[PDB]
């Protein structure tokens, strides 16, 4: 997150960290056993046994007392996800139940976010050509932008497909960046998934998200 | 290294990998107990006891049979190094001797490079906004560029100070990138240290190095 701020310890209890190999991205706890992230995080299709989910975390890949480490039973990419255009860029993670069938233990630092002043958070690059991830979870306030402004020839043109949305400033500055993929956009309810963007904080190039309200039926059907 | 190629296993035995905390950059073995790198790698001045030097390596931060791990006795930034302009951007690492006073064991994969068709190597970003380092050591062929072309108003203007040099293409493409700082430029003799660049592989923006021949007396004086 470029142009953002360090979030408080109990500010985003719904954010999730995903690890496999040397790869990382974020997510959103929408239910005790369900994490919603981007489809392009898992488009190389790693094994579910290679995936690690950490809930309750503030520093990236640092152990904490409220941190909760979980395994992934399975994940479901959207059936119509396009790796070329990043349309339908959302996936669902199913967490591994313990002996007594409790996936995530709810706490002041671990809590699911509801489904449908917007705020974006992640551990991505704090500068456009940053060498490392953000150690602390960063947060930023980004306004929702209209679809007519999204599909303007000077902003994004025809790249904006149904299911997408804009958030940020047409003047640049504050935006999402590399490493923030799959992270939440909360306006609290989950209103977006950090999906793609041409640059980090460029003028007339705000970040593009996944419209969570556009896929409410898909999430309800595939989280049962 | 953007636009580069995977180097062979015994192609650059003089390259060194430096680790401290979550920070990394490259270097050049110029002597059995001396590694030459960039001054801006160590401008935050970490302790020498926090520095790890790995010689003989092909995959970044991966153990190998020819790999040699060494401690750093001390390092010497250039006394006139400017963090504002990156002039005199070079530093010298002194390796830790063992019981019998042998710092680095020479092998087919560990060998110092001599001091004064140019080639640049490193584990940096393979794309401009890359999320991770290069796993394999990349190499690239970059031509030496004239100082008049360096100081052209359309290329770099007045940013080119004495002790600097250019290497790469005015058309873009192949160049050094983020994560390659301190790495070698060999034309073999060491002719440059990867120092700074405005973008990765931009048109009329080739990478800037440290002219090793400009600081030969300094290196000879401070490696005795």
């Amino acid at each position, epitope marked *: 997150v470029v142009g953002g701020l360090v979030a408080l310890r109990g500010a985003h209890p719904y954010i999730a960290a995903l690890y496999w190999g040397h790869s990382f991205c974020a997510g959103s706890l929408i239910a005790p056993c369900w994490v919603l992230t981007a489809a392009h995080c898992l488009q*190389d299709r790693p094994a579910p046994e290679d995936l690690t989910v950490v809930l309750g975390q503030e520093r990236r890949n640092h152990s904490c007392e409220p941190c909760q480490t979980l395994a992934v039973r399975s994940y479901r990419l959207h059936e*119509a996800f*396009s790796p070329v255009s990043y349309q339908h860029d959302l996936a669902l993670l199913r967490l591994q139940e313990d002996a007594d069938g409790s996936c995530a233990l709810l706490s002041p630092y671990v809590q699911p976010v509801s489904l449908p002043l917007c705020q974006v958070a992640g551990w991505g690059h704090q500068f456009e050509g940053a060498e490392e991830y953000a150690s602390f979870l960063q947060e930023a306030q980004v306004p929702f932008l209209s679809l007519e402004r999204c599909s303007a020839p000077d902003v994004h043109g*025809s790249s904006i497909l149904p299911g997408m949305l804009c958030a940020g400033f047409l003047e640049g500055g504050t935006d*999402a960046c590399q490493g923030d993929s799959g992270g939440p956009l909360v306006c609290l309810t989950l209103q977006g998934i950090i999906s*793609w*963007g041409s640059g980090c904080g460029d003028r007339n190039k705000p970040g593009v998200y996944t419209d969570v309200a556009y896929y409410l039926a898909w999430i309800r059907e595939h989280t049962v | 290294v953007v636009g580069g190629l995977v180097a062979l296993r015994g192609a650059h035995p003089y390259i060194a990998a430096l680790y401290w905390g979550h920070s990394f950059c490259a270097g050049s073995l110029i002597a059995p107990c001396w590694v030459l790198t960039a001054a801006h790698c160590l401008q935050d001045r970490p302790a020498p006891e926090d520095l790890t030097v790995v010689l003989g390596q092909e995959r970044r931060n991966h153990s190998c049979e020819p790999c040699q791990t060494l401690a750093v006795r001390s390092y010497r930034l250039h006394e006139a190094f400017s963090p504002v302009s990156y002039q005199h951007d070079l530093a010298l690492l002194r390796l830790q001797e063992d019981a019998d006073g042998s710092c680095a064991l020479l092998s087919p994969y560990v060998q110092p490079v001599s001091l004064p068709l140019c080639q640049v190597a490193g584990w940096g970003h393979q794309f*401009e906004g890359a999320e991770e380092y290069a796993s394999f050591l990349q190499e690239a062929q970059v031509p030496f560029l004239s100082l008049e072309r360096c100081s052209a108003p359309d290329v770099h203007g007045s940013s080119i100070l004495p002790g600097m040099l250019c290497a790469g293409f005015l058309e873009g493409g192949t160049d050094a990138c983020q994560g390659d700082s301190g790495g070698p430029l060999v034309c073999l003799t060491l002719q440059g240290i990867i120092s700074w660049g405005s973008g*990765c592989g931009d048109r009329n923006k080739p990478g800037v190095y440290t002219d090793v021949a400009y600081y030969l007396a300094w290196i000879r004086e401070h490696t005795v």
Partner: antibody, heavy 128, light 108 residues
Framework: VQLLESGGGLVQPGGSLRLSCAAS????????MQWVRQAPGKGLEWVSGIDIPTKGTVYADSVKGRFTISRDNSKNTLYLQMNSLRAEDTAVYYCARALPRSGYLISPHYYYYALDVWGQGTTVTVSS | SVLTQPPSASGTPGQRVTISCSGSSSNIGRNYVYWYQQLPGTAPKLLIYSNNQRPSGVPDRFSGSKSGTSASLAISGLRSEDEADYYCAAWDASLRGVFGGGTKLTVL
């Protein structure tokens, strides 16, 4: 960056043939490799692709079940095993690469899912 | 999937001609459009990607635009070296790159 095709020639109908595409100057691991055929006097026709994200291997319906595309990343070469070659499989077969999309950022420097580099082409004739 | 292109087009040097591609909601209206030029006896050459972007080395006089299920390519400042085959390209629902019929551009 160079792509070189080989293996073309005159084949009887119902025969078999294998094509090869040697790659040089770029990493034969970060790109999608494709076969595109140019029948004489017609247009382009996409045949096969390998290492396409969310897929393993994609075939055109006209060649499905008869053509097999595979890689030898160590040899930096691409194969196309053509079986049951019928009459309208005559074409100039091309080998091309496309860069897949990776993460959040799209850059003007990198040409995603576009066939930027092609090969010279190898001629396959299926006649009796 | 299939993409519809005019069989041929004509122009005078210095003029401006337009090559149009028509598709459906599964290839063009749902994804990017690409343009390739093929001189006789040579491999195709990438002209346009992402519906409006040019690879380095392609003149600024080549312009591409996309509007829903239709895409077009414009060549302004037409020269005698533009006599070639022009193809639109896309990927369908199962990826599987798709090519248009091709247009014969003639420079008269």
């Amino acid at each position: 960056v160079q792509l070189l095709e080989s293996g073309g020639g005159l084949v009887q109908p119902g025969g078999s043939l294998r094509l090869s595409c040697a790659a040089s100057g770029f990493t034969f691991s970060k790109y999608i490799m494709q076969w595109v055929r140019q029948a004489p006097g017609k247009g382009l026709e996409w045949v096969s692709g390998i290492d396409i994200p969310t897929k393993g291997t994609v075939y055109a319906d006209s060649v499905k079940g008869r053509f097999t595309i595979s890689r030898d990343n160590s040899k930096n070469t691409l194969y196309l095993q053509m079986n049951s070659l019928r009459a309208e499989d005559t074409a100039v077969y091309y080998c091309a690469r496309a860069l897949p999309r990776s993460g959040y950022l799209i850059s003007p420097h990198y040409y995603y899912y576009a066939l930027d580099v092609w090969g010279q082409g190898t001629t396959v004739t299926v006649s009796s | 999937s299939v993409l519809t292109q005019p069989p041929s087009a004509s122009g005078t040097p210095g003029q401006r001609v337009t090559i149009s591609c028509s598709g459906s909601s599964s290839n063009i209206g749902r994804n990017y459009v690409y343009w390739y030029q093929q001189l006789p006896g040579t491999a195709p050459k990438l002209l346009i990607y992402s519906n409006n972007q040019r690879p380095s080395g392609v003149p600024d006089r080549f312009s591409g635009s996309k509007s829903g299920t239709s895409a077009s390519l414009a060549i302004s400042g037409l020269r005698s070296e533009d006599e070639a085959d022009y193809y639109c390209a896309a990927w369908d629902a199962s990826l599987r790159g798709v090519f248009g019929g091709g247009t014969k551009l003639t420079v008269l």
